RNA sequence: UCUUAACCCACUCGUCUUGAAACACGGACCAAGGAGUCUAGCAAAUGUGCAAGUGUAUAUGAUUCUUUAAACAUUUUACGCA
RNA sequence: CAUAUUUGGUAGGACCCGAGAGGCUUUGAACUAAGCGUGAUGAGAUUGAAGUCAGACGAAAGUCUGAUGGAGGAUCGAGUUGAUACUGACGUGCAAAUCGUUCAUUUCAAUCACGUUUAGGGGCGAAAGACUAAUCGAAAAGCCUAUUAGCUGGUUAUUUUCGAAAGAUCUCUCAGGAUCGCUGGAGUUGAUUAAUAUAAUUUUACCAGGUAGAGAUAAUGAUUAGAGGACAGGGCCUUGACCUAUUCUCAAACUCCCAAUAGGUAAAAAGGGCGAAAUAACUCAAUUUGUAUUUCACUCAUAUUAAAUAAAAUAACUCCAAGUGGGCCAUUUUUGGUAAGCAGAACUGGCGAUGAGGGAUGCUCCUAACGCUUGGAUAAGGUGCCUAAAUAUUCGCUCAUGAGAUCCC
RNA sequence: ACAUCUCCCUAGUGCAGAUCUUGGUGGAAGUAGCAACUAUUCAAAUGAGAACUUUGAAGACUGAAGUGGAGAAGGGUUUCUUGUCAACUGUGAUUGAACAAGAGUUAGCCGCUCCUAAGGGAUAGCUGAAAAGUGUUUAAAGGGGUCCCCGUCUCAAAAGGGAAACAGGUUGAUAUUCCUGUGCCAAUAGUAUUAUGAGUUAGAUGGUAACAUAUAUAUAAAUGAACUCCUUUACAUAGGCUUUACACUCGGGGUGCGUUUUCUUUGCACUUUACCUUUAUAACAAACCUUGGAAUCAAUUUACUUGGAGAAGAGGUUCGUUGAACU
RNA sequence: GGCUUUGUGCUUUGCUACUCUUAAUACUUGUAUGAGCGUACCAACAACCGCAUCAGGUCUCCAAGGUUAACAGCCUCUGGUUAAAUAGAAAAAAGUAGGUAAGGGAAGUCGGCAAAAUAGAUCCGUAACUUCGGGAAAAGGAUUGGCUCUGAGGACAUUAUGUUAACUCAGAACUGAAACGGACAAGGGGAAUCCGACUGUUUAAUUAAAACAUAGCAUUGUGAAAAGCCACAACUGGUAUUAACACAAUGUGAUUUCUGCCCAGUGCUUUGAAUGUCAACUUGAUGAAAUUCAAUCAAGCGCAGGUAAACGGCGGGAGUAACUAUGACUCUCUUAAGGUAGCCAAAUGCCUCGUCAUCUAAUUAGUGACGCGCAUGAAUGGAUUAACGAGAUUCCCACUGUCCCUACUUGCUAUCUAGCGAAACCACAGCCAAGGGAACGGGCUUGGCAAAAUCAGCGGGGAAAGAAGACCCUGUUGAGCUUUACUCUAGUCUGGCUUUGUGAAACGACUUAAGAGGUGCUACUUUUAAAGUUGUUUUACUUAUCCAUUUAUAGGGAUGAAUUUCCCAAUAUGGAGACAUAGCCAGGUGGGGAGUUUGACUGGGGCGGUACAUCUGUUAAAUAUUAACGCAGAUGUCCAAAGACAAGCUCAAAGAGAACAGAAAUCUCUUGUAGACUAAAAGGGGAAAAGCUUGUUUGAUUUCUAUUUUCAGAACAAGUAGAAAACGUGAAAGCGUGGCCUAUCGAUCCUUUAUAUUUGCAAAAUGACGUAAAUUACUUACUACUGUGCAUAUAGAGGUGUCUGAAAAGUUACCACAGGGAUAACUGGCUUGUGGCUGCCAAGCGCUCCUAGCGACGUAGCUUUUUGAUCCUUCGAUGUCGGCUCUUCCUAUCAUUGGGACGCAGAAGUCUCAAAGUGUCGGAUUGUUCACCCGCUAAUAGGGAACGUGAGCUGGGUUUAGACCGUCGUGAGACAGGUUAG
């Protein structure tokens, strides 16, 4: 045989990302102890967007404390942000749109975004299009506060992790039927060689394994082990259950 | 000697092949080069020397020191095989 | 024992040449692939989405209609890029894919450059096992390497001598190998005394047979008929079976009997006779009862002979080694198959490896096997001419509007 | 230079053959052939010799997606002059990109050169026997100020970014480069003289406004440090509209040339004008400002746009095009 | 601020054209202005790459007039050129690029291929059908020149009048060989089916599509640095400048419409205080130690569920409706469930050219149907579709030299000349007929015959050339691909041990006591101790460790700017944590990856068989030998008796008797040569027995030869004759070393247990200071039989049936190589079964009548016009079907001529002879020989020529590689199955 396609594309060859003309990281301000014991204003100068990215950024100033100077960081907007609008960060911050606060201080049932994957991590978690969690329960001791992600995951993470309030902008985007192959060639030129991925049962057996026979059978259990060798590994990994859901 | 004659005879050589003149294969022609060897260890044969022994091994010696890179010698009682 | 040379075995390139491969380390993305970065490039027409304005009709709700407008992986399309078809031209080219004509592509999933990335079981692949520098179902370079080969081809002066096998047995064995056979050399033995050993032979003794043959009334398996009789079926008669004498045909897988041919043993001196004596741990009452052995005798044909016949020692015997292990043809016997120049045998002889003469001709039929020559007389075979010998002799037969002419043919 | 048969050791020792190896050579045969791309002719010159050298006269073709100008890759003296004809120039040949001899490429302003990108190579480390694999990832390493502040390095575009030149002439062959003229650009240390404008008894003014102002040979300087904050550099595609330039055309006058029996108040050529001078002004699409106070909506583009967050109107001002327009 | 100075760069006193700023100049300070490289020419029309002055390839910009929509095509000015590896002369064939054709109009051919028709504008007109957007340039029409006019469309300035520019539109006359998009560019159209929705992409040089991509539908995994998935040797990366509207892995493939059933099997996955099995370690027990044993809470598999838009799959019967029929309905076996919506002789129906319509003139074609469907069917997607197509296919119109049926013509070649000038190829060569021969000869033999030198053509032959046939077969040569072939192995999962520290709690097991249940001072079963010993599960701490973070920038509680609400007020930080992780062991998973195997015989190979080890009879040719996928068979055992010996008896059958066996396994007498019986298997042998019955028994023993069978005269195996022992039986001789005889089976290495007064474990020893003496001791003799464990030697047994003994599956139409006519598919050849053709006979038929015509039941030939049988020829290549074209030969005569016979009235017509002189057609359908129709006809005969005819063509079919559906195959793939493209 040949090492297969999703092989080749971990090589890190024409497979690493075009990032040519995404505008930088667009992680959150770090947490430090001025967000932490106190809190930072700051004003939202631009929204701006980017090709990798299915979320706008947001362009906020905010003032050197250590230093002279106004300094510009690039935050995640969330739907209802906008120019001129003043945004506030910290746990003495208070409750509003956009705002950047402890999940630990959160309202049960709000509304929030760009959740750290554990503290001090930026915005990892909640971060795509018209995402959002929600708050739905804070410990007794307040140690421990409790979130729901949009996989439906329950979640217990520290009350000092951060979060932004409200969702994140553009909501709606994957709902607009997509037209045609151009329309599909365009998305994936400023993501990565992802597209098309090409079927494994056409390919001579050389490559995928579902590959061979002329009658174009499969002939062999498409329902593959966890521990499955990563050249055999193509089907459907693990499966619980499969078929469509009828009841 | 060469040269035609005429009478009688005379089928492409090599080849693998039961069987090739073959409708089997190689060969346009000529020249030069071009293929059972050498070493190791074993055997019988025959020659040759010695004999219940045999083979001087490694090595030492010399008026050995164009030849001499072998030839010569074995202390003024190793080893092989039988 | 040493040594010289040889041949054979065996390791090596091992008689010389011949693969597809397998491994190691490097090198290529100027072609080509996909991506990236920086740039360029795409005549001209056609259609005419939304939005906009206007008009008409409509009691109304509303509906139409005309402009504007300039959308679209929209339309036609030079070009650019390709390369559908003419299975066009070309097909020892202009060319290791050209040329002509046709056709598809042209503002986008567009095309082109330049720069850039990923390298060999590796890349890259809108996937064809595609592409990766005329190279790809595993590149190119060099090395391991003179890889390996029961398989193919080739394998060099002369004369002379002896001269085969194509059966067998075992073999992951049927294109091979090994070991037997058959071959050559080398030696020894004993042969020279017209005989003894000896002999693909007969003689006389002596055997072994169940094939050819022959049989059904001998048995076995068959198998066709009537006749003569003392239980049965049918309707005391008929039909049967059954008995008895008969009767027809049978087998190479049946045998009462039974060949020819082919085959075995036999024909005396290292032995045999008839005797005595010895020896024993066998035997037997019986250490001479037998046995066997031994020592002594006496004596068996043989001047040629223990029946013939024999360029019967050119025999034996031992060694070392070779080639060969696919066979094929004929008569007679013969199995399978409709048959076969088919498949398979038996005995012998050939051919193969071997030819001269005949069979017109011809690998195998017939005659006959060969140093070089001269002469002779023949063989097979012929004798009108081709074509050497008789238009011979002698008795028959034969006329053919497709006569007929010699084994294998 | 050659033999040894008198004897004997030794050998890479005897060829017809391997689609043998290497080299030469025939028959095939003066044959296959010298078949894309419209066409050449006449006379002359040269020279020993001319269908295919040169000149002239005809006829024609390429037909501005050119057999035309310029350039890149790549080639590398092929250029160019003078000779020249052994081989080559698949026919001829005096020809030639062939051969021999020489000559020829000149830059402050044109490129590279400078910068970063997609990228490559290293440092810091850490792995790996080493070879190498990586690239801030446990850093006591480069720069700027007056002890502080920044802070991995380096190569990578001859079509991205980027400081500055044009016109006419000239040689056998180069020219934005030589030459002549006009200019432009980056610089241009220290101290001392001098002139130029400012300010003074330490830092100008105008304009309600948007904003303007140093015209000295020369539009030169309009207080300013640390530390900061901005902006140019600097960007897709499509569609129309509009402005200029170059190009193209028509008509008049002026010069010369052409047709001209007949007809033609005719056909043709020429009628040229650069950068540079904060180019000076004018012009115009926009932007901005004062006044003004709009519905009965108005102003208004091919297109729809705009307006109490102030339109029309009225009066200005600026930017940008442009580049002697217009007193 | 400038000038001056004390005091301490600083400060007080005193003074006031000064302080800035450009440019020029002088003087000093290394020499105080201009670095370095490139710059020719070509850019293919000869300079670059293509081995080369190669018609190929090779990047960018500049862009004139007329015509016109136009930078197209066509001609022209500026600029360029008139050279292309030759010239001349002739003008036929033949070639090639072209033209043109009467009448017909696809009737030729697989195919309308080719060619032509069509095409521009303006004006009209435009359907089925549709997702209402299209279809659409639909279809179908008309017009178009030239000339002379008419009408419409601006800009300026005088108050309705002037001056003045571009051009485009519309209308009317006249005019002409009715001609005008006058060259030029430029669509053929319609009716339908099948497939794919679409734009897109692809086999560089035989492949543009029905394949791929695609939007849409759907699935799976994954919440994060201890995650998914993938890459790396290692450290580490990539996805990731990421974040579930995501990332990754897949499947189906627009719209419209639906997507049934089944979890057994194989997968994937989930639960487990009931659970079977399952390793290293550890723990315990045992032994003197080595050892040997137990025991334990791994994953895993198993059990039990979930899962079919996971892989996949979708039977058979019965019983049953007032006729026959079918069987809704009921029951059933099997299996997991047994084909639902649909759908069809389809690119899918073997049979098949299925049946019915219709289309035609004739329909293996087309279409619509039908549908017990060899073998349709529901995301393996079924059904339907407008738009769309260099798609596959049928038909109709238009058009036509495709064709009837060819003819004429132009260019360029050919041709000839001058000059130049190759190559492939070549045993030797070159006339035939027949024979034989390697069964097809250019040379051979016998015949025909046979006369230079040449010039032009052509493809009959040279089994012409290419090049160690890619077919096929063979190799203990390969390679690619696959699996539940064998053997591994990366990855991965899981356990142990270490790195790896510090504490706490809870829980089980084990030991002893007391109660309860049961048994014979003693022992068993069960409940409670909480005491001891021991294992586990939860947890706190952080120093190991791991991660994150930032310019390491705040001790702790209450669309301006920030620089020289309130109190006390002038481990760098989080997170996880001794678990991770990493290391080392260990089990599992593991075609992802690796290496390798994939017999032989064989009337080709494969399938099939076993003739591969054996035994009988026969073939077998009267000793012996002897084979074939010869024939008739048999074998892999069974037997404490069916072995051994003795003794006694006589069987099968027949008749006659006895209420039961005449007639489910009996009783008696008589007759009874074996007709019974002897385990099986067939043949031999066997009657006071080798049969049957009975008694007593175990020799079915230990040791050893000579040997015989097969045979090399080796083995093994099977035998024979004895011998040394000990016995058994009869006891009496005798007989017994398995089976009445011919058949009933296995080396070495390895394993295992027997056996020994025999041995070894390498400097020594292990019974034993045994037995004696001696004892001032390191005493001295004398002893036949001496540790665990391992090793032997000998003897059996465990097994090799591909049977003188490899640890071994598939596949290649993607393939490579070595060989093969020792071996298939092709001609030829032998043979001629089979096919085809002719006979003879005489029972019948033929009204009567064997024979006018026939001819059964039989029997004899001929042929190679069928197919076999075959494997002699050719495998370092004889080109594998059909058609076309084109010629020749045969006769077995279909017609035509002359006749004979007749069941011949005439007319027809039939059988037939001499006869090959002469002829033997147009089409429909087919890939097709063949076939099957329709029509004409004089009849539309049959055959040969290497299955006549590929350097004659054609390339439609069989038969390379792409692709498709069905069946079959887990799979790769297969399919003398269909289909499209080559």
Redesign the pocket.
């Known amino acids: 045989?040949?090492?297969?396609?999703?092989?080749?594309?971990?090589?890190?060859?024409?497979?690493?990302?075009?990032?040519?003309?995404?505008?930088?990281?667009?992680?959150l301000?770090?947490?430090?102890?001025?967000?932490?014991?106190?809190?930072?204003?700051g004003?939202?100068?631009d929204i701006i967007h980017?090709p990798?990215?299915?979320?706008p950024l947001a362009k906020v100033?905010?003032?050197?404390?250590?230093?002279?100077?106004?300094?510009?960081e690039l935050i995640?907007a969330s739907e209802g942000m906008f120019?001129?609008?003043?945004i506030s960060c910290?746990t003495?911050a208070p409750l509003s749109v956009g705002n950047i606060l402890p999940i630990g201080k959160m309202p049960e049932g709000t509304l929030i975004?760009?959740?750290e994957?554990?503290?001090?991590?930026?915005?990892?978690?909640?971060?795509?299009?018209?995402?959002?969690?929600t708050v739905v329960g804070q410990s007794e001791d307040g140690?421990k506060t409790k979130v729901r992600?949009?996989?439906?995951?329950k979640?217990t993470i520290?009350a000092?992790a951060r979060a932004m309030v409200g969702?994140?902008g553009?909501?709606?985007?994957?709902?607009?039927?997509?037209?045609?192959?151009?329309?599909?060639?365009?998305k994936?030129?400023?993501?990565?060689?992802?597209?098309?991925?090409?079927?494994?049962?056409?390919?001579?057996?050389?490559?995928?394994?579902?590959?061979?026979?002329?009658?174009?059978?499969?002939?062999?259990?498409?329902?593959?082990?966890?521990?499955?060798?990563?050249?055999?590994?193509?089907?459907?990994?693990?499966?619980?259950?499969?078929?469509?859901?009828?009841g």
């Not at 092989?7 to 992680?27: D, E, P, T, V």
């Not at 100033?61 to 510009?72: A, L, N, P, S």
Request: one cysteine or more; hydrophobic letters at 30%.
């Open positions: 045989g040949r090492v297969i396609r999703g092989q080749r594309k971990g090589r890190g060859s024409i497979f690493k990302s075009h990032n040519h003309h995404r505008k930088g990281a667009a992680k301000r770090h947490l430090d102890y001025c967000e932490k014991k106190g809190y930072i204003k004003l939202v100068k980017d990798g990215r299915g979320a100033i905010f003032k050197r404390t250590e230093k002279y100077g106004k300094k510009e995640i120019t001129g609008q003043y910290g003495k975004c760009n959740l994957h554990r503290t001090g991590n930026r915005g990892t978690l909640v971060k795509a299009s018209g995402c959002y969690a140690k992600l949009p996989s439906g995951a979640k520290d000092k969702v994140v553009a909501g709606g985007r994957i709902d607009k039927p997509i037209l045609k192959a151009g329309v599909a060639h365009h994936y030129r400023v993501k990565r060689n992802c597209w098309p991925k090409v079927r494994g049962v056409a390919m001579n057996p050389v490559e995928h394994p579902h590959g061979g026979g002329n009658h174009q059978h499969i002939g062999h259990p498409s329902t593959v082990s966890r521990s499955a060798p990563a050249g055999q590994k193509v089907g459907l990994i693990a499966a619980r259950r499969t078929g469509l859901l009828r």
